[PDB]
Amino acid sequence: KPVVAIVGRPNVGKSTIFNIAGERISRIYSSAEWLNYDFNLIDTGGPFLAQIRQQAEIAMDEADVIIFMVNGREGVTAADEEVAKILYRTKKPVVLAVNKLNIYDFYSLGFGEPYPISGTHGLGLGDLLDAVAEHFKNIPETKYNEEVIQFCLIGRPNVGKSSLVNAMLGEERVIVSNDAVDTSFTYNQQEFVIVDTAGMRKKGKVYETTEKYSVLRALKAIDRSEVVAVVLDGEEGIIEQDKRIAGYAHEAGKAVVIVVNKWDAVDKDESTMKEFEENIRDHFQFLDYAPILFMSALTKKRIHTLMPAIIKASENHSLRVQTNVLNDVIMDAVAMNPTPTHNGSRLKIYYATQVSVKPPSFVVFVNDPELMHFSYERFLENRIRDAFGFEGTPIKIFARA
Ligand SMILES: Nc1nc2c(ncn2[C@@H]2O[C@H](COP(=O)(O)OP(=O)(O)O)[C@@H](O)[C@H]2O)c(=O)[nH]1
Ligand SMILES: Nc1nc2c(ncn2[C@@H]2O[C@H](COP(=O)(O)OP(=O)(O)O)[C@@H](O)[C@H]2O)c(=O)[nH]1
């Protein structure tokens, strides 16, 4: 079922590698017999920059996974950087392949680990194809246009999720559209989809006789979303079940916004809001990046703040940083906070780059990864946040030799 395209400037060796393909499906090719993997290929044959652009465009729309190819003998070229600069506009997985041949500043292209390959005898192909196949189980069951922002609202039953969605969808800036498990709409003319509103529209038809299926349904909604709105009940406060879904959204690397509903019903004061906020921070210690919003679906108070926060969390989730700035910020962290020694060896940081988006992920090339301690990693994380923002999203840092 899965579809794969190969993209790159001309003369990097795409034809040799492509020619992994068996027989044409009458365009689309099936994978050859020797491959222990099951997928289809899409051809992209059919001034210099605009004719490269056509290929990448088609690949981005149809392919589930994209192999980005460069030439090892040339190194990274501006032409490669341009193809890179197009491929940034997709949320579909890209895997980088270095042909003809060392593997240092291909990380600069910003797609992570470069997989070296030769086409004469197919050296490196196993590793490449394993890397591509790993993405197959994360392919969207339901497919939307690239522009659409997908988010979910999850929480415990009777926290007012349905009320919130109806309160949100009844605003002047919103236009509701017209696979009716999801709700489509625009807000300030941007397209959005709320994942799994069917499970939210379930009651009235069905008695929910146990939470265990609701929770598993919510985990699946999360898998499909870029932003997760975790809704807490203002009246009752945080109980133990709240933590599970939220931890899952965090571990899955999704953008998160915390929403406290039913704020109309708490006995307010300036102190009451700040106490509830710090209580969230104590119970949800892994969601420090997540903004907290107080609103009432009932009386419509501060409902207008929800969509701007989803947009912003979504923007930061997809943010791609410049390498020179990134390395300046990390060297500024090392200068303000000298690295801890380890018996007799000090951590040295050579170079940093971004390896992916959604969530933002960074690789730091070091001496030895073991000397990079959890606490110092957290320190780098915080320094990265102060320089770039990143509100609403987790970020990942990995040290590599
Ligand atoms: N030495 C070496 N040369 C290669 C390899 N793969 C491709 N080439 C050469 O690079 C050239 C570029 O291939 P090309 O047919 O332009 O593929 P395109 O990317 O679809 O244009 C080919 O003529 C190959 O001879 C390789 O693994 N090793
Ligand atoms: N006091 C108060 N009650 C609310 C608010 N929002 C929803 N409710 C009530 O909470 C109950 C559960 O609402 P529902 O939308 O079914 O929550 P869901 O289980 O998350 O879908 C309903 O009876 C609503 O009347 C609010 O902002 N304030």
Looking from the CA of 252 toward its CB, the CA atoms found within 13 Å total 21
Burial of 200 (0-12, 13-18, 19+ CB in 10 A): buried
CA terminus-to-terminus distance, the chain: 37
Pairing of the two strands 65-71 and 3-7 = parallel
Over the range 292-302, which residues count as b (16 or more CB within 10 Å of their CB) and which as e?
Answer: bbbbbbbeeee
| CB within 8 Å of 281: residues ≥ 6 apart | 288
Contact 117, 125 (CB under 8 A): yes
Q: What is the CATH number of domain 1-141?
A: 3.40.50.300
Other CB atoms within 10 A of residue 390 CB: 21
Residue 16 CA to ligand 1 centre (angstroms):
6
Residues in the chain: 401
Domain 142-319: what homologous superfamily?
Answer: P-loop containing nucleotide triphosphate hydrolases (3.40.50.300)
What is the three-class DSSP state of 85?
A: helix
DSSP conformation letters of 336-361: HSPPPEETTEE--EEEEEEEETTTTE
**How many angstroms separate the alpha carbon of residue 12 from the centre of ligand 1?**
6
Quick one: tokens of 173? 């800036």
DSSP 217-285: HHHHHHHH-SEEEEEEETTT---THHHHHHHHHHHTT-EEEEEEE-GGGS---HHHHHHHHHHHHHH-G
**Nearest alpha carbon to residue 117 among 101, 95, 130:** 101
Give yes or no for a cis peptide into 291 (omega within 30° of 0).
Answer: no
Its CATH architecture, for the domain 320-401, is 2-Layer Sandwich (3.30)
- As a three-state string, the secondary structure of 22-79 is EEEECCEEEECCCCCCCCEEECCCCCCHHHHHHHHHHHHHHCCEEEEEEECCCCCCHH
At 100 the three-state DSSP class reads coil
CA dihedral angle for residue 379, residue 383, residue 388, residue 392, rounded to 10 degrees: 30
Are 360 and 392 a contacting pair, CB within 8 Å?
no
Residues 6+ apart with CB under 8 A from 287: 230, 246, 250, 256, 258, 280
Domain boundaries along the sequence of the chain: 1-141, 142-319, 320-401
Task: For 93, list phi and psi in degrees, rounded to 5.
Answer: -60, 135
Which ligand is closest in space to the CA of residue 10? 1
Do the domains 142-319 and 1-141 match in fold? yes
Protein residue whose Cα sits closest to atom 4 of ligand 1: 100
Q: Give the method of determination.
A: X-ray
Which residue of 152, 153, 158, 197 sits with most ligand 2 atoms within 8 Å of its CB, as the best mutation to test the pocket?
158
Alpha-carbon 17 to chain mean position: 29
8 A C-beta contact, residue 88 and residue 116:
no
Q: Provide the pairing of β-strand 94-99 with 114-116.
A: parallel
Provide φ and ψ at 111, rounded to 5°: -115, 10
- Return the structure tokens found at 224: 């499909």
Q: Please, are residues 130 and 201 in contact by the beta-carbon 8 Å criterion?
A: no
Atom of ligand 2 nearest to the CA of 161: 20
* Biggest CA-to-CA distance, the chain: 74
CA nearest neighbour of 227 among 200, 192, 266, 184: 192
- Residue 124: phi and psi, rounded to 5, are 90, -15
In angstroms, how far is CA 216 from the centroid of its own chain?
Answer: 21
Query: Which ligand is nearest to the Cα of residue 154, counting in written order?
Result: 2
Question: Angle at CA 356, nearest 5°, toward 350 and 358?
Answer: 135
CA distances from 209 to 153, 185, 212, 347 (A): 21, 31, 9, 55
Binding-site residues, ligand 2, Cβ < 6 A:
155, 157-163, 200, 261-262, 264-265, 296-298
